Amino acid sequence: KKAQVISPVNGDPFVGMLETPVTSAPIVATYLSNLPAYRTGVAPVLRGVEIGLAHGFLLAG
Amino acid sequence: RRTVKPASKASTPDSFWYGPERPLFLGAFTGEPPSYLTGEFPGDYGWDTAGLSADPETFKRYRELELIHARWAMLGALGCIFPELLGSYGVPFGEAVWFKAGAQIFQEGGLDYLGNPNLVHAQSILAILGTQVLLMGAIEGYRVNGGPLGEGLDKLYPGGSFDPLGLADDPDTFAELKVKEIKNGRLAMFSMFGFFVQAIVTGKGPLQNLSDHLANPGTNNAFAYATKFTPQ
Amino acid sequence: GIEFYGPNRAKWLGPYSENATPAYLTGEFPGDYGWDTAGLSADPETFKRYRELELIHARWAMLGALGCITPELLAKSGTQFGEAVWFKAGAQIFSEGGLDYLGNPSLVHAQNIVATLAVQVILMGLVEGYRVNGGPAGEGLDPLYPGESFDPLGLADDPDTFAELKVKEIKNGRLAMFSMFGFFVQAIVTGKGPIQNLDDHLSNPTVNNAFAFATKFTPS
Amino acid sequence: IEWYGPDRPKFLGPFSEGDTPAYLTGEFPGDYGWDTAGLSADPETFKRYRELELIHARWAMLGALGCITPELLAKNGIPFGEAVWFKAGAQIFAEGGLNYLGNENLIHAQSIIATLAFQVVVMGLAEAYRANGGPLGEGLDPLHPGGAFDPLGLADDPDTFAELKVKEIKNGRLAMFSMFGFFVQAIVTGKGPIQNLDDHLANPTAVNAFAYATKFTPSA
Amino acid sequence: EASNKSFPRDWVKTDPLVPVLGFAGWTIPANIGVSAFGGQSLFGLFTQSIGENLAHFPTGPALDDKFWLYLITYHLGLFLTITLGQIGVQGRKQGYW
Amino acid sequence: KKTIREKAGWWSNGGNEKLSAFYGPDRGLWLGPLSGTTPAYLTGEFPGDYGWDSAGLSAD
Numbered sequence: 065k066k067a068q069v070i071s072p073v074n075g076d077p078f079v080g081m082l083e084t085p086v087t088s089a090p091i092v093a094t095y096l097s098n099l100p101a102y103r104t105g106v107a108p109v110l111r112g113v114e115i116g117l118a119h120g121f122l123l124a125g
Numbered sequence: 126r127r128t129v130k131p132a133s134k135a136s137t138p139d140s141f142w143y144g145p146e147r148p149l150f151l152g153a154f155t156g157e158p159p160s161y162l163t164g165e166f167p168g169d170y171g172w173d174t175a176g177l178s179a180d181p182e183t184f185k186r187y188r189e190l191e192l193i194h195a196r197w198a199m200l201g202a203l204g205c206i207f208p209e210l211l212g213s214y215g216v217p218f219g220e221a222v223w224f225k226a227g228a229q230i231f232q233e234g235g236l237d238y239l240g241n242p243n244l245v246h247a248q249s250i251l252a253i254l255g256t257q258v259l260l261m262g263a264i265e266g267y268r269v270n271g272g273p274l275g276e277g278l279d280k281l282y283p284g285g286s287f288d289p290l291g292l293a294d295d296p297d298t299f300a301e302l303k304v305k306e307i308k309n310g311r312l313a314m315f316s317m318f319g320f321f322v323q324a325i326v327t328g329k330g331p332l333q334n335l336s337d338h339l340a341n342p343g344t345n346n347a348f349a350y351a352t353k354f355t356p357q
Numbered sequence: 358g359i360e361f362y363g364p365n366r367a368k369w370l371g372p373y374s375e376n377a378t379p380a381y382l383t384g385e386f387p388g389d390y391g392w393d394t395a396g397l398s399a400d401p402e403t404f405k406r407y408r409e410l411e412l413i414h415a416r417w418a419m420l421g422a423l424g425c426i427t428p429e430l431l432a433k434s435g436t437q438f439g440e441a442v443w444f445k446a447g448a449q450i451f452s453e454g455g456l457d458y459l460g461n462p463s464l465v466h467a468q469n470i471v472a473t474l475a476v477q478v479i480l481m482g483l484v485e486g487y488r489v490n491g492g493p494a495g496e497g498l499d500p501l502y503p504g505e506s507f508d509p510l511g512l513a514d515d516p517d518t519f520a521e522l523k524v525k526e527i528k529n530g531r532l533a534m535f536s537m538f539g540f541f542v543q544a545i546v547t548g549k550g551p552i553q554n555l556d557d558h559l560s561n562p563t564v565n566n567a568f569a570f571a572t573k574f575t576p577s
Numbered sequence: 578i579e580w581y582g583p584d585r586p587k588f589l590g591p592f593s594e595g596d597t598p599a600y601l602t603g604e605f606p607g608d609y610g611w612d613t614a615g616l617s618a619d620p621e622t623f624k625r626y627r628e629l630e631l632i633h634a635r636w637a638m639l640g641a642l643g644c645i646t647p648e649l650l651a652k653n654g655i656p657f658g659e660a661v662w663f664k665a666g667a668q669i670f671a672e673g674g675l676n677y678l679g680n681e682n683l684i685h686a687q688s689i690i691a692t693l694a695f696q697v698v699v700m701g702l703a704e705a706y707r708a709n710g711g712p713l714g715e716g717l718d719p720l721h722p723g724g725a726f727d728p729l730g731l732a733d734d735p736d737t738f739a740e741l742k743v744k745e746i747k748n749g750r751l752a753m754f755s756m757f758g759f760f761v762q763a764i765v766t767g768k769g770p771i772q773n774l775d776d777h778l779a780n781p782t783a784v785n786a787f788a789y790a791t792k793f794t795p796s797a
Numbered sequence: 798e799a800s801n802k803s804f805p806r807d808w809v810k811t812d813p814l815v816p817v818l819g820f821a822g823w824t825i826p827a828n829i830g831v832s833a834f835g836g837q838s839l840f841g842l843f844t845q846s847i848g849e850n851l852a853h854f855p856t857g858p859a860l861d862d863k864f865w866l867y868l869i870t871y872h873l874g875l876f877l878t879i880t881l882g883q884i885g886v887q888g889r890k891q892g893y894w
Numbered sequence: 895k896k897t898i899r900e901k902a903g904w905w906s907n908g909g910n911e912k913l914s915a916f917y918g919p920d921r922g923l924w925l926g927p928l929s930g931t932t933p934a935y936l937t938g939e940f941p942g943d944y945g946w947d948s949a950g951l952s953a954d
């Protein structure tokens with residue numbers, strides 16, 4: 065009856081986020097890390113340009 | 126999101142298709158493979174029941190033959206399936222079925238690519254054959270002995286211009302993609318053997334063979350053509 | 358003065374075989390007449406794999422030779438055999454009553470070839486994997502002469518009897534393989550059974566031989 | 578030109594420096610470096626394959642000449658009941674049998690069984706003598722014995738011997754290729770080689786092999 | 798949770814045999830013809846409807862098509878078989894019984 | 895040896911090996927791989943140097 069999935073956040077049981085598949089699945093973590101919001105080394109103007117292109121294109125529909 | 130740590134601690138935790146603890150061609154019934162099939166080369170399931178590659182250099186030449194046959198057979202499977210598949214949609218080929226597509230050069234308007242007269246529009250057989258043997262000899266000798274797209278490169282996995290998108294920079298991903306290549310190619314070689322055989326016994330296109338099978342699988346299988354090659 | 362082993366064993370060309378033998382064909386293995394003109398067994402490991410292939414083909418060809426001879430004999434004798442000839446004995450599944458075993462409609466009465474093939478492939482894979490690496494009838498035995506349950510009669514507990522029965526086995530098996538190749542080629546050429554081919558050859562030996570079917574495959 | 582050593586002529590010409598195996602030393606005649614399949618990695622399998630190559634070469638040369646000669650002589654004016662080579666065997670079943678050059682009183686063979694018996698007995702004798710020696714030799718080369726097989730004495734110099742070896746094996750590879758062509762294009766065309774050349778010279782762009790390309794399509 | 802310090806990446810203990818075996822355990826019984834379907838099968842009729850609705854690809858299936866019944870039932874059984882196969886395999890390997 | 899996006903031509907201001915095809919010894923020549931002996935005075939220092947002085951008019 066081994067192999068529990070849900071873990072405390074970064075192993076800290078007192079910070080209170082409970083890492084979980086929806087939170088820390090490598091596919092999910094990868095996709096969210098590759099989003100311009102989380103590209104912390106890239107210039108904010110260009111991340112803003114990408115985010116704005118996406119949102120302006122989608123909210124016209 | 127966490128950073129994956131390097132492979133000094135993790136040199137081979139992913140080597141599932143290589144090494145002594147690798148899958149074999151009879152599963153648990155294989156026992157132990159021959160002493161030369163040790164799991165360093167891709168697709169090594171320990172299948173040498175005839176001992177034809179007992180010598181290491183003959184084994185190398187057979188690996189070359191197998192991989193080249195595998196690539197040619199993958200191209201051939203896709204090339205026999207694609208024209209018939211698009212001929213089932215309304216693209217007007219002359220003969221979309223592969224074992225009749227060669228005779229399209231004997232048509233009235235010649236061999237039309239995608240059935241389009243303004244496309245290749247080949248009218249002769251031996252200009253095709255001459256051009257093809259010229260260029261194929263050039264590039265097959267290049268594959269053999271260097272050339273414009275690589276001279277000191279590998280014999281089977283040269284890369285360079287043949288890895289333009291760089292899918293073989295990671296050696297782990299390269300060792301996995303080699304197994305994927307050889308397995309897809311053995312599947313395509315088996316499927317091209319099937320193309321040949323179930324063209325000979327049936328005479329219909331492979332996708333039409335599949336249509337016939339899924340029309341009535343209990344009736345339209347290969348045993349419906351078992352009595353066709355009876356003596357007289 | 359027969360040996361079937363050692364340097365002065367019986368060989369494939371008889372008296373003209375002293376310079377016809379490779380150095381690796383030591384008189385160690387059964388049926389070693391010194392016939393490797395093609396040099397296909399120069400490597401001892403390829404030689405071992407080829408010996409296994411030879412013996413398994415031999416046993417399967419013996420079983421198949423007996424299986425092609427028996428039903429026609431029983432057919433000529435008096436038995437009902439919907440299709441006695443061996444190279445259409447497989448097409449009995451597509452008849453009205455299916456494949457009856459000895460003509461009895463209530464012995465086997467097989468109607469579906471796909472289920473027959475499924476059970477055959479399952480059982481055959483299981484037994485051939487057990488033949489490769491062992492199983493319920495011998496975890497660690499010889500790949501060719503396991504014994505110890507495949508000898509319920511116990512014929513080969515003496516090494517000399519073992520050796521001579523080995524030679525007898527491989528030679529009856531080479532005979533059966535030759536005869537099975539003959540079955541194949543002369544069924545394709547003649548279209549009749551082996552027993553009927555012998556009947557026709559005994560009817561008229563100088564007329565009805567293979568040369569009467571020689572101009573059959575000419576392109577023209 | 579060398580025909581030997583490291584910089585010998587090779588089967589891909591200028592494209593051939595990196596493909597040649599390490600075991601294909603320029604030692605044996607016809608060594609162009611063509612072992613892409615690696616079938617001769619073992620020197621002993623290589624020796625057996627060289628013997629097979631040379632014997633197939635000589636037999637294919639004799640057979641090429643034997644298929645070309647009777648048709649030439651057939652249009653040259655000489656009667657030939659069946660001049661075409663792939664039915665020259667069916668002359669035994671004609672009314673007058675197989676008459677050699679159309680003369681009824683040269684051979685006049687009526688039985689194929691006795692012809693084959695003759696042939697087997699002395700072909701076996703000759704091929705066994707080829708294997709291990711006999712009345713013309715007993716310890717000579719298995720491939721270039723000489724002695725009684727050089728009544729003219731062409732190859733007493735090693736350099737003449739080597740160049741005639743290369744000439745032999747290359748005319749023989751040419752004849753083997755041409756004999757494979759004879760076979761495949763007799764099956765495809767159904768006519769003789771000389772008549773195939775006549776038809777190709779009558780209309781080279783229309784009467785070629787591609788005119789018989791849709792011949793073996795299943796169409797079912 | 799004294800364990801689980803870093804949310805192991807292999808949270809789904811994947812066995813590639815599991816999807817194949819659930820698919821085969823469902824679809825093969827789903828290829829058995831029965832009296833209620835008129836001699837046909839659930840997978841057979843489902844694929845027949847897939848074909849009939851791919852014959853007009855843009856136009857989706859109707860409310861009265863019967864493709865949805867076959868779809869939902871086939872996938873009920875299939876998802877159940879696949880998840881129960883994963884559960885059983887990973888309980889066999891682990892404890893749980 | 896590189897990554898996908900450097901092969902695809904990204905990251906302007908990486909240009910010192912891009913002058914190599916238009917200046918220097920191993921540049922593009924007028925007959926391409928079939929022009930071996932370029933005139934010694936066409937050293938590859940001037941723009942448009944493809945090694946074409948068949949008539950030797952620019953020897954001085």
Ligand code: CHL
Binds near residue numbers: 367390531696697701
């Ligand atoms: C000196 C006498 C002597 C001779 C000549 C032979 C000859 C032979 N023995 Mg041998 N033996 C001899 C003594 C002895 N043998 C044996 C024990 C054995 C055994 C156990 C075996 C042999 C075998 C052989 C054959 C091996 C070579 C071969 O495969 O033929 C290749 C040549 C041919 C097949 C030529 C065929 C002749 C004929 C003209 C063919 C007709 C041509 C067709 C019309 C063309 C085809 C048409 C196409 C287009 C469809 C060969 C015929 C082997 C065998 O049976 O293989 C067949 C074998 O297994 N011998 C013993 C006991 C110690 C001997 C004692 O003296």
Ligand code: CLA
Binds near residue numbers: 471
């Ligand atoms: C993976 C490759 C592959 C695939 C997908 C197919 C698929 C098909 N083949 Mg082809 N075939 C193949 C390889 C393949 N074949 C090879 C290698 C050969 C040469 C031995 C043939 C020879 C062949 C013939 C002669 C005929 C077909 C036919 C068919 C169709 C009906 C199935 C049948 O009769 O089975 C026959 C299968 C074989 C003879 C051997 C292939 C074995 C498979 C690939 C492995 C086993 C998987 C299978 C699901 C399990 C079967 C065991 C079962 C009894 C329990 C079907 C579309 C028939 C057709 O067109 O009907 C309309 C037909 O007449 N095939």
Ligand code: CLA
Binds near residue numbers: 538540542546555
């Ligand atoms: C020992 C096994 C064996 C036996 C007992 C027979 C017996 C027979 N065969 Mg079969 N056959 C065999 C092996 C055998 N064959 C093999 C290995 C082949 C493949 C090459 C064939 C191919 C074959 C064909 C294609 C045909 C026969 C036919 C026949 C029958 C007529 C004889 C004949 O034409 O000879 C032909 C024999 C051979 C082609 C090769 C066999 C070699 C023998 C065993 C060695 C020589 C023994 C001989 C007595 C001594 C030399 C005789 C001399 C004239 C040369 C006869 C019932 C014919 C038939 O059906 O008639 C009713 C026929 O059409 N056979």
Ligand code: CLA
Binds near residue numbers: 254774787
């Ligand atoms: C050097 C030996 C040789 C010679 C002189 C010939 C000569 C001939 N053959 Mg034969 N043939 C040969 C070898 C040879 N062949 C081989 C090895 C094969 C087996 C692949 C065949 C299979 C064959 C068939 C099936 C047919 C012929 C036919 C013919 C005739 C028409 C030419 C043709 O269709 O080419 C076909 C040639 C080949 C299929 C392969 C031979 C390869 C050659 C020697 C190399 C290429 C040389 C060429 C001039 C340069 C390239 C040309 C370019 C367009 C690619 C002609 C008399 C046809 C006939 O009877 O017409 C009257 C016919 O139906 N041949």
Ligand SMILES: CC1=C[C@H](O)CC(C)(C)[C@H]1/C=C/C(C)=C/C=C/C(C)=C/C=C/C=C(C)/C=C/C=C(C)/C=C/C1=C(C)C[C@H](O)CC1(C)C
Binds near residue numbers: 197201
């Ligand atoms: C492993 C092992 C082990 C042990 O030891 C022993 C043994 C058993 C011997 C082994 C086995 C082996 C095998 C099985 C093999 C197989 C092979 C094959 C099948 C191949 C194919 C192969 C195949 C191939 C190449 C294919 C190819 C293809 C191609 C080119 C194509 C082309 C084309 C097309 C597109 C179509 C069109 O319209 C036309 C044409 C022109 C036709």
Ligand SMILES: CC1=C[C@H](O)CC(C)(C)[C@H]1/C=C/C(C)=C/C=C/C(C)=C/C=C/C=C(C)/C=C/C=C(C)/C=C/C1=C(C)C[C@H](O)CC1(C)C
Binds near residue numbers: 393420423
């Ligand atoms: C030695 C040598 C030497 C040098 O060096 C080289 C060389 C020359 C290469 C070599 C040789 C070789 C050879 C000759 C081989 C042969 C083989 C064979 C013949 C086999 C058979 C083989 C055979 C076999 C298996 C057989 C088998 C059989 C069987 C299963 C059967 C089955 C069946 C029957 C009962 C009948 C029914 O109705 C059905 C069926 C189902 C049909």
Ligand SMILES: CC1=C[C@H](O)CC(C)(C)[C@H]1/C=C/C(C)=C/C=C/C(C)=C/C=C/C=C(C)/C=C/C=C(C)/C=C/C1=C(C)C[C@H](O)CC1(C)C
Binds near residue numbers: 611633642643661757
């Ligand atoms: C090198 C290499 C390399 C890599 O590594 C691998 C591989 C690819 C495998 C290899 C290759 C190989 C090959 C190609 C082979 C071929 C063969 C041949 C063609 C033979 C012929 C062969 C041929 C031959 C013997 C021929 C012979 C002939 C003869 C006897 C004749 C006879 C006759 C005549 C006069 C005619 C009359 O009416 C009758 C008769 C009786 C019919």
Ligand SMILES: CC1=C[C@H](O)CC(C)(C)[C@H]1/C=C/C(C)=C/C=C/C(C)=C/C=C/C=C(C)/C=C/C=C(C)/C=C/C1=C(C)C[C@H](O)CC1(C)C
Binds near residue numbers: 947950
């Ligand atoms: C490099 C080399 C090398 C070697 O070593 C030597 C050699 C060969 C000598 C050399 C080469 C050279 C060359 C090729 C040159 C060329 C030139 C040209 C083409 C020019 C043009 C040139 C051209 C030009 C200027 C042009 C111009 C134009 C113009 C003004 C225009 C005007 C006009 C117009 C708008 C229109 C109006 O309405 C009128 C007009 C009045 C008409």
